[PDB]
Amino acid sequence: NQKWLEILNKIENKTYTKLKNGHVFRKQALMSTLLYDGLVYWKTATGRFKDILALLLVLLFLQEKDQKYIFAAVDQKPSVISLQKLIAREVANEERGMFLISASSAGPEMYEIHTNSKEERNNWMRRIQQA
Amino acid sequence: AIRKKLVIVGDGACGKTCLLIVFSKDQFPEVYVPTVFENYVADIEVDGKQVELALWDTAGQEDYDRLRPLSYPDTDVILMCFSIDSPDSLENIPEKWTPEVKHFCPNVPIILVGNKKDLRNDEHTRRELAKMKQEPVKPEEGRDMANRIGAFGYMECSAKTKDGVREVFEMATRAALQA
Ligand SMILES: Nc1nc2c(ncn2[C@@H]2O[C@H](COP(=O)(O)OP(=O)(O)OP(O)(O)=S)[C@@H](O)[C@H]2O)c(=O)[nH]1
Ligand SMILES: [Mg+2]
């Protein structure tokens, strides 16, 4: 909760992410709590890695803008995943990796996320299954 | 340490997960969970080369059609499956799987795989099939379907018999390694 207050005031104020169904998601929806947060790397379609603050609340991906956070803007994809539409799986190839699928009927999306360690990946997967 | 990605597709209940699992773990899915999305991994030796095959398992149920695009992105070889106890599953090869695989994975080699090769001669199946003017799929048929769709090769196997399983993945890896 304390950590959550600061993260929140660090989030840049005019920041939003477009959803596949044409709605938007803005910081304001975060005023309406934080279960756990962590630094991960998001593998893009081209095999590049994006440094990301991942927040489990839905799932929210932030990128840094100096001392500010913005909602991630990675390959035109939404930076927020609804937990009810979430499919989560281990990357069999990569003991640090998990696959996170938004199965949205407006257009599913894959997010392949790598943590720093096998332990942290299983840590994320346990905490994610509960929700 | 060479990495290749294989994706398996085909009608629901035609034996894809059992084939992947039997091959990756020698085990055999007793409790039958229809698939939504899974991936496994296995190491295979072919022609001197060590290859790590990432095995992407997909849903045969059309209810999940919209998730399948998510498995195609970087595929080195497709295992396109039907079941020999279901000449229906065979006719879906040109109607549904070949058009989708060609859309998402143009120029990716395809192994046409007939599963459940054991039930060709099981009366239970072979009688129900007769109950509807049908009969198990025949190698000429499977092979003709493979020529029709342009497959790299044609292979038949039984996850339960385990016969030919190994040969499915050797051929797929040879195709993956193919320029
Ligand atoms: N006799 C015989 N039965 C098999 C064989 N392979 C699979 N089966 C059985 O058929 C059923 C379907 O197999 P499964 O591997 O789960 O299909 P699937 O193709 O993954 O199905 P889905 O996930 O798209 S819905 C299972 O209960 C399984 O044990 C086989 O080679 N021979
Ligand atoms: Mg399956």
Curated annotation (Swiss-Prot), chain A:
Subcellular location: Cytoplasm; Cell membrane
Domain PH: 33-131
Taxonomy, superkingdom: Eukaryota
PTM description: Phosphorylated on tyrosine upon stimulation of cells by laminin.
Signal peptide annotation: none
Quaternary assembly: Homooligomer; forms cytoplasmic aggregates. Forms a complex with MAPK8 and MAPK8IP1. Interacts with RHOA. Interacts with microtubules. Interacts with YWHAE and YWHAH. Interacts with PTK2/FAK1. Interacts with NEFL. Interacts with CTNND2; prevents interaction with RHOA.
Function field: Functions as a RHOA-specific guanine nucleotide exchange factor regulating signaling pathways downstream of integrins and growth factor receptors. Functions in axonal branching, synapse formation and dendritic morphogenesis. Also functions in focal adhesion formation, cell motility and B-lymphocytes activation. May regulate NEFL expression and aggregation and play a role in apoptosis.
Name recorded for this polypeptide: Rho guanine nucleotide exchange factor 28
Residues of the full protein shown: 1051 to 1186 of 1705
Curated annotation (Swiss-Prot), chain B:
Protein name (database record): Transforming protein RhoA
The protein's required cofactors: Mg(2+)
Switch II region: annotated segments: 59-76
Function statement: Small GTPase which cycles between an active GTP-bound and an inactive GDP-bound state. Mainly associated with cytoskeleton organization, in active state binds to a variety of effector proteins to regulate cellular responses such as cytoskeletal dynamics, cell migration and cell cycle. Regulates a signal transduction pathway linking plasma membrane receptors to the assembly of focal adhesions and actin stress fibers. Involved in a microtubule-dependent signal that is required for the myosin contractile ring formation during cell cycle cytokinesis. (Microbial infection) Serves as a target for the yopT cysteine peptidase from Yersinia pestis, vector of the plague.
Gene symbol of the encoding locus: RHOA
Cysteine-cysteine disulfides: none
Organism the protein comes from: Homo sapiens (Human)
Pfam families reported for this sequence: Ras
Post-translational modification (Microbial infection) O-AMP-tyrosine, affected residues: 32
Effect noted on mutating residue 61 to L: Causes constitutive activation
